[PDB]
């Protein structure tokens, strides 16, 4: 039945029906077991597409708000705002859902370094998405939580994954993105990104057969952001 | 900024 | 408030959130007025994206059913089938929703030839989608209903729209697709498609400034299907 | 077969 949930997850993925792919993988996370690499990727992809869609809508709607803000079209702005807010509510719910699954099931039942780094990194990511559109104190809370999860993923990763491991690199990438876009700290964003790249270049022999394209790509992305930021 |  | 519903429809469209674009435009159809060309296109695009998604999922899932059918993998097939059937249920509901809005509001309140041809053509299309995946008697019913709506759109179109009008051409296109894919009648599909093309070529001066690219395209599509079918 |  675990094997069926995974199969249904795959069916849902091919059909591009991500809500159900989330439902399938939630159930598998609810079994309080260590998930396979496959099942971690399925969960991740399920939740990324579902959140991805709203994040895309939120930006489109913000852009239009900003347009109507500069033209002073106040009648439309009421509608734009109500609509942004509805989407923010979806984003909150989706993020709270996975954050909960992480705290109550995935993180507790994790037993390898790879999965622990993955889950705390995920938790950092999802708090960071809450923070992308939050204001004031809510923004603060998501920032503190996101920092705390990214530090926890970092502590375990630093001691337990080669610097080439794509999860470690992915962690560096996003944690440096966090510092730049959320803490508004280009100096730390760049020191972190530069170091993670450099550490993987110093040990390129440690690249796995399984994940060299993933790693390569992540390092390309590290490079692209350093450019962007300088 | 691009994330993974 | 009619103007607001249309604006919300547009916001939803840009955000790629089609469910709400349908909700907005349903309300506008519920006002028992002749819709503007804009509002007909918004309704159409709203319902096409919502149905489009399930039609795409249904094919993907069928393809995989067919694969598992030839390998004799019967354990998976249970899951594939349950999943196809769930999607069929969505398709039925979405089609019944718009078919209802058409019969109870749009068609009754239509007062120009353009809108009458549009709405009966729409009704033909949506019965045809029901028929795409229906079996047995249900397939028959959708076919009879779809034929009847396409004939009704044809009667009004023949007398009231130049042969170049994109709605008339779009009607011919889909009605010939109907004959080919649903009634399994390549001879009528081709006679219809050939005639609609030819009639527009005989009167190319009748092409509107508003819709020549649309018409052009439709005629290209008529051409592409005649090829496919011969 | 392609529809409009």
Author numbering:
A (entry chain A), C (entry chain A): 3 to 232
B (entry chain P), D (entry chain P): 3 to 6
Which statements did the authors publish about this structure?
In human cells, the NELF complex (comprising the four subunits NELFA, NELFB, NELFCD, and NELFE) inhibits RNA pol II elongation shortly after initiation to induce promoter-proximal pausing. We identified the RNA-binding subunit of the NELF complex NELFE as a substrate of p38-MK2-dependent phosphorylation after UV light. We show that MK2-dependent phosphorylation of cellular proteins triggers the recruitment of 14-3-3 dimers. Phosphorylation of the RNA-binding subunit NELFE on S115 by MK2 promotes its binding to 14-3-3 and dissociation of the NELF complex from chromatin that is accompanied by RNA pol II elongation in genes functioning in telomere maintenance, RNA metabolism, cell cycle, and DNA repair.
To investigate whether the binding between NELFE and 14-3-3 after UV light is direct, we synthesized a biotinylated phospho-peptide centered around serine 115 and performed pull downs with recombinant 14-3-3. We could observe binding of 14-3-3 to the phosphorylated peptide, whereas no binding was detected if the peptide was dephosphorylated before the pull down. Although the asymmetric unit of the crystal contained one 14-3-3 epsilon and one phosphorylated peptide (Yellow), 14-3-3 epsilon forms homo dimers with symmetry-related neighboring molecules in the crystal (Cyan). As reported for other 14-3-3-phospho-peptide complexes, the N-terminal four helices, αA, αB, αC, and αD, are essential and two salt bridges between Arg19 on one molecule and Glu92 on another are the driving force for the 14-3-3 dimer formation. In addition, Tyr85 sitting under the conserved lysine position on αD forms an accessorial hydrogen bond with Glu22, supporting homo dimer formation in the crystal. 14-3-3 epsilon has a peptide-binding groove, composed of αC, αE, αG, and αI that catches the phosphorylated peptide. Especially the conserved triad of Arg57, Arg130, and Tyr131 produces a positively charged patch, directly interacting with the phosphate group of the phosphorylated peptide. In addition, a few hydrogen bonds and salt bridges between the main chain of the phosphorylated peptide and 14-3-3 epsilon contribute to the complex formation and adjust its relative orientation.
